A paper describes a structure:
We sought to use our protocol to design a human transferrin receptor (hTfR) binding protein. hTfR transports transferrin (the major carrier of iron in the body) across the blood–brain barrier (BBB) via receptor mediated transcytosis, and this process has been exploited to deliver therapeutic payloads into the brain parenchyma that would otherwise be blocked by the BBB. We targeted the region surrounding an edge strand located in the hTfR apical domain.
The structure of [name] superimposes closely on the computational model with an rmsd of 1.2 Å; this is notable as the fold is more complex than that of previous computationally designed binders. The majority of the mutants that improved binding map to the interface between hTfR and [name] and likely optimize packing interactions and electrostatic contacts. Biolayer interferometry of five variants revealed KD’s ranging from 20 to 400 nM. Following injection of three Alexa488 labeled designs spanning two orders of magnitude in KD ([name] 2 μM, [name].3 200 nM, and [name].5 20 nM) into the vascular channel, we observed transport of [name].3 and [name].5 into the CNS channel.
Numbering used by the authors:
A (entry chain A): 121 to 759
B (entry chain C), D (entry chain D): 1 to 88
C (entry chain B): 121 to 760
C-alpha cells in the first residue's frame, strides 16, 4: 500500500522525467494554429487530445458536442472615423483587425470621453459626463463586459478599448487584439440551459448581452485619436504622455461595428480515471483549448498541462500501484474565449448528474505567465489544501517553498468572470481553484496575434521548470483529494469568511438601528455555523477511518457545504451565479453591503424594502447552511 | 482607381445622398485617408494643390465638391489630416 | 430478527386493542373544541400532544414556533345588501358569521352573476359577462382561491360563496362556514422563506393573494338573493330549483368585507422514533390540529390517528423488538385551514436539512369522511406500495380487500392546493400520499360549526373500525417504508406518466411540424428514462442485499428521482411548486399542453415564444432526470 | 329603540349625507330589515300603513322621508321586502 509520502515522491520523480516545452511547441505548430472556436484546427486539436487520452489507457474517454452561437467579423469592415466641421471633414482612424464578440452591430457618432479603465469608480471620479457619448477605455483591471456594462449603465453609446504602452509595453503599437463583451458565461443565446439539439434552440437572449457597440483599437489608432482631443489625463492613471481626455469642440468620432452571429459546433473532450472505492465522486481538471490567435499562453500551456497530468496519473495507476479512492476527470473545453461556453454549457447540461458527485474543479488556464509571484484564487474550502501545498513545492527559480507569506489567505482575490472556475464555483456550487506563476503586470500578448511559443519562451527561458512546478501543484491537489479516506476540504475556512462579513455589516449598526432592525440573528447564524464546523471536526477526530459507513456519512455533510451557499430563492436560469459569497446579483452578501452603504447619503439610491428582503434571505441562507451542517433536523434549538 | 471612385460618387450623389454622408460612405468603402467637402471648385483646387504641395506622396482626386486623399502610412495620414484642417 | 409477515399482524393486533373514538371525542371536548389558529385551546391541544409524545417515550420530542399573519373578522360586521330604485330601496340580505380569510377588505356594488362552481370552464360557458360585476358561486369542485382567481381574471369585483341543498344536504339553511382564498400555501406574507424572527419579517406579499372581496353566505341568504334575480340555472349544474342566474336590471348587490390581519404564534409539535440502521433518512407523518369550528372530521380524526400511530409504533419498538432501519417523524401542524401554513413554513425553514433525507410524507387529514369509497392521491413512486397495501387490508364494512379495481392508478386524481401533501410533493420534491374513506359527495359540515363529534358518529356509526382501517393503511405504509433495505419506491411508475404525456403531445403533431419543430428528442428522452429505470432495476437485482453500502448507494439513486423532477429553471421563491408533473406554473407539462392547445384556435392566446421555451426546458428536464438516473456522467450512452 | 334611530338619521342628514347612503348606513348600523326613501311624507305614511297592514309583525318607523322596517324572521323579511317593492 502507498501513503502520501510515497505518492508525492512518485509524482515528483515522474515530473522530473517529463518535458513540457516539446508538447507546448507541438501545440504551437502550423497544424493547430490558429484555433478559433469551432474552426477546423480546433477540431483537429480536439481529436488529437482525444486520441492521446486513448493512448494513456484511461478508464474511459468520451466527447460532448454542442452547437453555440458566437460572433465574428463581417465582410463589411468595422471602422473608427473622425468627422469635423459638421461632417465636411472626415478622417479614417482605423479599420481594426480585431473585434469584440457579442458587440451590438451598429454605428454611433458623438464625442469621445476617456474613462481610464472603465470601472465604476473611474466613472464616478469623472467631471465630463458620458451620457450620449462614446467612451475610450484602456484594457486591464476588469473584463471587457464589465467595462461595457459600466459604460451602458451611464447612457454611453459606444466603447473603444486599446492598450497603453505604460501598462502594455508593446513595441509594435499597431497590434490588434480580441475579447468578448458578454456579461456572463456560456452561450448567451441558451442562458441557463444547455446548447443541445434537444432544446431545439428557442428564442432566448441573455441579459448580459450589451446593447451598445464596443470595438478594439491599436495603440497607434488610440494616439491618433488622442491627437484630436484635449485635456491632460490625470497622473493617477499612470498612462502614456500622449494620453488626452475629451475631443475638441467640432470633432466627433463615428464607430461602425458590423459583426454577425455564427452557429458553430464545439467539442468538449473528456477522459476519466475511475476510483477504486468511491468512483461516483470525482475531481474535474479542465483547460481551455481554443484561442483567437495562436494562444500559447492561455490555451497551449493549459492543454499541455492537462495532457501531461492525465498521462502521469494513468501511468501511476497502471504501473506504480496508485489507487485513488475517487475518480479523476480531465476535460478539454472549447469556446473558452467567448466566456466559458464549453464548460458552462457542460455544467448546464449535466447539472443533475454532478449535483453532489463532482466535488472539486482545478482550472489550468493561464497557469504560466511569469516567474515573480504565485497567485491563486479559489473557494475557502481549498485554502488549507493550497497552503499545505505551498509548504512543500519549491519555486522554479528561487528554489524556496511557495509558502512565504503567513497571511496569504487574507489577500486572496475572488474568481472573476473571465475565469473558467467561476461558473464551476458560483453556478454549480463546486469548489474550484485557479493558480498561476505570473508577474505584477498583465501578459501583454494575451488575445493578440503575438501569443506565440517564441515570444513565450523568450520572456520565460525556464518555461519547462515553471510548467513542472505548476503541474506539481495541480498533481498534489489531485492526489490530496483522491488518495485518502478523508477529503482535504476545510469547512472551518468559511468561519472567518462569515466573521468578516457580519463585522463589515456591524460597521453600519446605527443604520440597522434606525430602521428598527437587528443583526443579532446574523450573529446567531454565524455562531451556529462555527459550532457546526467544530462539531464536525470533533466527530471526524473521534470516528475510526476504517468504518466506511460513518466516514461516508461525514463526507456527505462535507460535500454539501458549498451547495448550501447557493441562494435557494433566485431563479438559476435568470441568475445563474447563485453563490451568496462569489456569485453575482442582488442575492449576494456584497450586494447587501453595497445597498446598505447607500443609506447614509440620504439620496434616493437606497432601496430599503430590497435591503430588508436581502437581509432576511441572506440571514436564512446562512442559518440553513448552519442547520444542515449541524446534523439531523431534530437536533436544532430554538428560543 | 480614380474612375471607380468617381463613378461611385456619381451614383451616390444622383441617388439623393448628401455630400457629407457620401464622403463617409466613400471612406468606409475605399479605405481612403481623408475626404473634404468643399463649397465650390475653387476650394477644391486650393485644398488639392495645397495637400499635393505639402504632401507629394499623397494621391488626391477632386470630384463634385469632394476632395479624396489616399495615402498608405500613418505619419503621412496625420500630415494630410493636419494640412486639410489648416487649408479648410 | 423479524420479517414483514410478523410486523403486519403484530401491528394488526395492536390496532384491534386500540380505541380511536375515545381519543376523538376527547379532542372534541370543551377544553379544545374551538381551536382557531393561534387560540388558547389550540395551544393547549398542542401541549397535550407534546406531553402524549413524551409519555410514549419517543426518541425525541420537540416543537417549532412560527409567527404568521392570518385574517380575522372585524368589530364591524361584513354585510350583503340589495339596493334598488337608485338606492331608494335598501334590503339587508345577510350579516354572515363565517368569512374567507385573506379576502380584500373593501365595499363593492354591482350586478350579481351566477357562475356555478367558478371553474374556468364555467366562466367560459357563460352568456352573461362577469366584468365589473359580483359573482356568486357554489362551494365544491375547486378551492375558494381558485374560484376567486378565476373570477378576478375576468375583471370581477366580488365573490360570494354558498352551499346549495342539492350538493350539501343540510337542514339548517342558515349555517355559516369558513374558507380562505390564498392561491398558495404557507404564510402569504413570507412567500418562499420561513416565518421566523431571523428574517425580521420584511415587506413581501405573495402573488396568490386576491385583490377582490370574497364572503361566504348561507343557503337562506343565497335563496333571498335568487328571489331578486332572473333566469333559470342550467340543468347541467344539478342545483336547487330556486337557483337564479342574473339580478334584475335596476337591482344591485352591495358586498362589504372588513376583515383585518392578525399576527399569531403557531406551534408545530414533533416526535421522532430514530432508526437503527439509517437514522438520518426518515418519513414524515403529519396531521392538521387547528380548525375554525369544532373540526372533528378534518383535524380531530387526523390528530387522533397521529397520536395512536405514534403510540403503537413506540410500543412496537420498545416492547416487540421492531427495529426500523430509517427514522419516523410524527408532526402535528397548526394553521392548517389558512392554507398549509405550518407544514409549508416548516418545509421552507428546514429545506436544506430535508434535501435528500426525508423521502416520504404521509398525510392523515380528513382520512375518515365516509365508508363507500377508498380514495388516494399520491406521487407515482408510492403507487405500487399503495397497491401492495390495498391487497391485504380489508374494508371496515364489506370485509373485502380494498384492492378491487385493477386499473385504479389510471383514475388517481393529483394532489390539490388544499391538501397538506401538495407542498411536500410539488415544492420540496418529497413523495407524498393522502388517502381517505369517503363518499361520492363532499362532507357537508367541513368548515362549519356543525363539524362536531356527534354529527360524525351519527353519520359514521362504525367510526372506530374505519379509523382502525385508516391507521392500518398508514402503519403498513410506514412499516414497508422503514423496515427493509429497499425503500419500496417504484420509480418505473413514472414511465407510464411519461407515456401519457407524449401521447397527448402526439395529438398536436400537425402543429409541431407547422412550427418547424420535432418531437424526436422527447421520444428519445422517454426511451432513455425507461432504459435508466431498467438499468436501476438490474443493478438492484445483481447487488446483494446484505452489502449495506451498495444498497444505500442504490437507494440514494432512488431518493433523487422525485427531486430531479423539480424544475431547475424557475425561482423557488416566486414559483415554489416546481414539480413539472404536480406543480403549478408555466414550467409544468400540463401548462405546456394547455398552451399548445391554442395553436389550432389561431387567436392571440397562443404564445409561440413561450411554448418554444416550455418545450425546450421540459424536454431537457426529462432528459436530465434520465441521465442522472442512468448512473455516472461518463456512463451515459445515447445518440446525442 | 325607535328614537335613537331617529336621532341617527337626523344627525346624518344634517352632516350632508344624502338620503340613500344614509339609509345604507342605517341598515348597516342598526341591522334593520328594509329602508325606503320616499318623496314626501304623505307617500311615507301611505307605504308605512301598507306595510303595517300586510305585515303587522313588523316595526315600522317614519322620519325625514325615511321608512325603516325591522323584523326578526326571514319569511316576514321577504314579505316586507316584496310589499315595499310593490307599494313603492
Ligand atoms: C419574534 O417576532 C414576534 C412577532 O413580531 C414577536 O412577538 C411579539 O412581540 C412583542 C414584543 O414582545 C409583543 O408585544 C408585547 O406583547 C405583550 C404580551 O402581553 C399579553 O398579555 C397582556 C396581559 O398580560 C395583554 O395586555 C397583551 O395585549 C398581550 O395579550 C404585551 O404585554 C406587551 O405590552 C407591553 O409592552 C408594550 C411595548 O412592547 C407597551 O406598549 C405596553 O404598554 C406594555 O408595557 C407588548 O404588547 C407582541 O404581542 C408579540 N406578538 C405575538 C403574536 O406574539 C416576538 O417578540 C419576536 N421575538 C423576539 C425574540 O424578538
Ligand atoms: C443539431 O443542430 C445543428 C445546428 O442547427 C445541426 O447542424 C446543421 O445541420 C444542417 C443540416 O444538416 C446544416 O445545414 C446544411 O449545410 C450544408 C452546408 O454544409 C448545406 O449545403 C445544406 O443545404 C444545409 O443548409 C448546417 O450547416 C449545420 N450547422 C452546423 C453549425 O453544423 C445538426 O445537423 C443538428 N443535428 C441533428 C441530429 O439534428
Ligand atoms: C447629458 O445630460 C445633460 C443634462 O443636463 C444634457 O444637458 C442639457 O442640460 C440642460 C439643463 O441645463 C437641459 O435643459 C437640456 O435638455 C439638456 N440637453 C439635452 C439634449 O437633454 C446633455 O445634453 C446630455 N447629453 C446627451 C448626449 O444626451
Ligand atoms: C425597490 O425594490 C423593489 C423590489 O426589488 C422594487 O419593486 C419592484 O418594482 C418593479 C418595477 O417598479 C415591479 O415590476 C416589481 O413587481 C416590484 N417588486 C415587487 C412589488 O415585489 C422597487 O421598484 C424598487 N424601488 C426603486 C425606487 O428602485
Ligand atoms: C364589461 O365589458 C364590456 C365590454 O368592454 C362593457 O360594455 C361596453 O362598455 C362601453 C363603455 O365603457 C360601451 O361603449 C360599449 O358599447 C359596451 N359594449 C357592449 C357590447 O355593450 C361593459 O360595460 C362592461 N361591464 C361593466 C360592468 O363594466
Ligand atoms: C409571450 O411570452 C414571452 C415569454 O414568457 C413574454 O416575454 C416577456 O415579456 C415581458 C414584458 O415585456 C418581459 O418583461 C419578459 O422579460 C419577457 N420574457 C421573455 C422570456 O421574453 C411575452 O410578453 C408574452 N406575450 C404575451 C402577449 O403574452
Ligand atoms: Ca448560457
Ligand atoms: Ca409562506
Amino acid at each position: 500500500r502507498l501513503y502520501w509520502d510515497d505518492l508525492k515522491r512518485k509524482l515528483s520523480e515522474k515530473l522530473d522525467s517529463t518535458d513540457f516545452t516539446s508538447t507546448i511547441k507541438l501545440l504551437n505548430e502550423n497544424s493547430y494554429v490558429p484555433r478559433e472556436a469551432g474552426s477546423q484546427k480546433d477540431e483537429n486539436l480536439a481529436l488529437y487530445v482525444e486520441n492521446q487520452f486513448r493512448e494513456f489507457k484511461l478508464s474511459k474517454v468520451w466527447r460532448d458536442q454542442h452547437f453555440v452561437k458566437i460572433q465574428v467579423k463581417d465582410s463589411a469592415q468595422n471602422s473608427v472615423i473622425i468627422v469635423d466641421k459638421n461632417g465636411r471633414l472626415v478622417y479614417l482612424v482605423e479599420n481594426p483587425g480585431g473585434y469584440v464578440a457579442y458587440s451590438k452591430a451598429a454605428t454611433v457618432t458623438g464625442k469621445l470621453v476617456h474613462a481610464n479603465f472603465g470601472t465604476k469608480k473611474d466613472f464616478e471620479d469623472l467631471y465630463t459626463p458620458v451620457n450620449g457619448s462614446i467612451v475610450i477605455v484602456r484594457a486591464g483591471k476588469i473584463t471587457f463586459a464589465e467595462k461595457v456594462a459600466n459604460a451602458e449603465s451611464l447612457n454611453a453609446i459606444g466603447v473603444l478599448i486599446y492598450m497603453d504602452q505604460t501598462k502594455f509595453p508593446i513595441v509594435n503599437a499597431e497590434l490588434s487584439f480580441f475579447g468578448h463583451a458578454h456579461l456572463g458565461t456560456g452561450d448567451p443565446y441558451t442562458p441557463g440551459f444547455p446548447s443541445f439539439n434537444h432544446t431545439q434552440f428557442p428564442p432566448s437572449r441573455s441579459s448580459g448581452l450589451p446593447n451598445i457597440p464596443v470595438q478594439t483599437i491599436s495603440r497607434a489608432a488610440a494616439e491618433k485619436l488622442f491627437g484630436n482631443m484635449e485635456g491632460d489625463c490625470p497622473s493617477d492613471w499612470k498612462t502614456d504622455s500622449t494620453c488626452r481626455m475629451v475631443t475638441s469642440e467640432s470633432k466627433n468620432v463615428k464607430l461602425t461595428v458590423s459583426n454577425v452571429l455564427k452557429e458553430i459546433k464545439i467539442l468538449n473532450i473528456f477522459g476519466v480515471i475511475k476510483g477504486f472505492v468511491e468512483p461516483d465522486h470525482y475531481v474535474v481538471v479542465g483547460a481551455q483549448r481554443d484561442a483567437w490567435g495562436p494562444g500559447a499562453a492561455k490555451s497551449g500551456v493549459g492543454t499541455a498541462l492537462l495532457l501531461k497530468l492525465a498521462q502521469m496519473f494513468s501511468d501511476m495507476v497502471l504501473k506504480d500501484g496508485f489507487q485513488p479512492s475517487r475518480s479523476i476527470i480531465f476535460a478539454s473545453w472549447s469556446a473558452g474565449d467567448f466566456g466559458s461556453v464549453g464548460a458552462t454549457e457542460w455544467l448546464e447540461g449535466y447539472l443533475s448528474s454532478l449535483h453532489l458527485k463532482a466535488f472539486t474543479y482545478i482550472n489550468l488556464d493561464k497557469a504560466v505567465l511569469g516567474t515573480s509571484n504565485f497567485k491563486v484564487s479559489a473557494s475557502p474550502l481549498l485554502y488549507t489544501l493550497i497552503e499545505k501545498t505551498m509548504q512543500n513545492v519549491k519555486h522554479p527559480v528561487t528554489g524556496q517553498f511557495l509558502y512565504q507569506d503567513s497571511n496569504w489567505a487574507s489577500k486572496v482575490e475572488k474568481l472573476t468572470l473571465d475565469n473558467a472556475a467561476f461558473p464551476f464555483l458560483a453556478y454549480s456550487g463546486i469548489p474550484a481553484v485557479s493558480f498561476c506563476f505570473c508577474e505584477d503586470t498583465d501578459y501583454p500578448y494575451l488575445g493578440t496575434t503575438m501569443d506565440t511559443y517564441k515570444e513565450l519562451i523568450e520572456r520565460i527561458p525556464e518555461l519547462n521548470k515553471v510548467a513542472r512546478a505548476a503541474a506539481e501543484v495541480a498533481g498534489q491537489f489531485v492526489i490530496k483529494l483522491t488518495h485518502d479516506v478523508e477529503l482535504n476540504l476545510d469547512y472551518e475556512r468559511y468561519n472567518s469568511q462569515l466573521l468578516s462579513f457580519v463585522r463589515d455589516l456591524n460597521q453600519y449598526r446605527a443604520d440597522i438601528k434606525e430602521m428598527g432592525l437587528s443583526l443579532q440573528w446574523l450573529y446567531s447564524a454565524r455562531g451556529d455555523f462555527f459550532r457546526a464546523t467544530s462539531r464536525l471536526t470533533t466527530d471526524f477526530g473521534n470516528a475510526e477511518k476504517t468504518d466506511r459507513f460513518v466516514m461516508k456519512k461525514l463526507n456527505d455533510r462535507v460535500m454539501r457545504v458549498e451547495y448550501h451557499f447557493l441562494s435557494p430563492y433566485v431563479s438559476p436560469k435568470e441568475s445563474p451565479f447563485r453563490h451568496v459569497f462569489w456569485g453575482s446579483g442582488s442575492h449576494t452578501l456584497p450586494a447587501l453591503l453595497e445597498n446598505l452603504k447607500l443609506r447614509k447619503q440620504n439620496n434616493g439610491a437606497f432601496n430599503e424594502t430590497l435591503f430588508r428582503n436581502q437581509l432576511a434571505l441572506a440571514t436564512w441562507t446562512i442559518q440553513g447552511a448552519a442547520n444542515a451542517l449541524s446534523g439531523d433536523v431534530w437536533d436544532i434549538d430554538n428560543e | 482607381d480614380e474612375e471607380e471612385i468617381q463613378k461611385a460618387i456619381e451614383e451616390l450623389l444622383r441617388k439623393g445622398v448628401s455630400e457629407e454622408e457620401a464622403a463617409i460612405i466613400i471612406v468606409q468603402r475605399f479605405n481612403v485617408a481623408v475626404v473634404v467637402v468643399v463649397q465650390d471648385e475653387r476650394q477644391g483646387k486650393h485644398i488639392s494643390e495645397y495637400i499635393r504641395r505639402y504632401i507629394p506622396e499623397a494621391d488626391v482626386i477632386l470630384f463634385a465638391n469632394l476632395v479624396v486623399i489616399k495615402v498608405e502610412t500613418h505619419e503621412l495620414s496625420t500630415r494630410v489630416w493636419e494640412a486639410a484642417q489648416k487649408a479648410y
